[PDB]
């Protein structure tokens, strides 16, 4: 593996014929409350739009997935809760090693009453999010879709 670029959140490498993008692991948090799922939106320069995502972030040096999940939920929404590890997935194993760990957040509590408004909190019924996407009103990130699908599969009971 030869390196063409070493950066902030990623490294571009070449492994023979394969173009590989090394990337820090990430976490995502699925939170449901009274029928509404906690979605978030922020302008994403990579796509030039703000897709419907769920609280997510990169794992910091020294912390594990669980700790990153707790911190992410807190920084984005000022909330904490009972977190349970659900599953993990490689975002696109064909070119990047980015791995995402997904957690479920229950019994949410306020720990902080973001002042910069960098992240838009969008509480919405998953059925409504799916409906809007099917209509072409909003785009989904992998985490947003996973949250929607996970809800319909196991959280209606």
Ligand X SMILES: Nc1ncnc2c1ncn2[C@@H]1O[C@H](COP(=O)(O)OP(=O)(O)OC[C@H]2O[C@H](O)[C@H](O)[C@@H]2O)[C@@H](O)[C@H]1O
* Contact footprint for ligand X (CB under 6 A): 8-9, 17-20, 26, 46, 56-58, 92-95, 98, 141, 143
> What are the structure tokens assigned to 47, written together?
């796509």
As measured in angstroms, the least distance from the Cβ of 157 to ligand X is: 28
| 94 known ligand binder | yes
| 120 known ligand binder | no
d(CA 120, CA 38): 10
| 17 known ligand binder | no
> What are the structure tokens assigned to 143, written together?
């985490």
115 counts as catalytic: yes
| Binding partner of 84, given its own copies, ligand X, none, CB within 5-8 angstroms per partner class | none
Encode burial over 70-92: b for 16+ CB neighbours within 10 A, e otherwise: bbbbbebbebbbebeeeeeeebe
> What are the structure tokens assigned to 25, written together?
């692991």
Closest Cα to residue 133, out of 123, 120, 145? 145
Residue nearest to ligand X (CB): 94
Question: Which CB, 35 or 50, lies closer to ligand X?
Answer: 50
Residue of 112, 115, 117, 120 marked active site: 115
Map the footprint of its own copies across residues 44-83, applying CB under 8 A. Answer: 44-47, 51, 53
List C-alpha distances in Å: 89 to 11, 96, 110.
20, 12, 29
Annotated binding site: 19, 44, 60, 72, 76, 94
Binding site for Mg(2+): residue ranges? 72
């Amino acid at each position: 593996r030869t390196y063409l670029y070493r950066g902030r959140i990623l490294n571009l490498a070449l492994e023979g014929r394969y173009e590989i993008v090394e990337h820090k692991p990430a976490v995502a948090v699925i939170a449901l409350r009274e029928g509404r799922m906690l979605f978030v939106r922020q302008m994403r320069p990579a796509v030039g739009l703000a897709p419907l995502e769920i609280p997510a972030g990169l794992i910091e040096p020294g912390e594990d997935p669980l700790e990153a999940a707790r911190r992410e939920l807190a920084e984005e929404t000022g909330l904490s809760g009972d977190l349970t590890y659900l599953f993990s997935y490689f975002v696109s194993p064909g070119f990047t090693d980015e791995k995402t760990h997904v957690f479920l957040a229950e019994n949410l509590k306020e720990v902080e009453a973001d002042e910069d408004e960098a992240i838009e909190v969008v509480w919405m019924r998953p059925e409504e999010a799916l409906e809007r996407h099917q209509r072409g009103e909003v785009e989904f990130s992998a985490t947003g879709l996973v949250g929607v699908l996970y809800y319909h599969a196991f959280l209606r009971g």
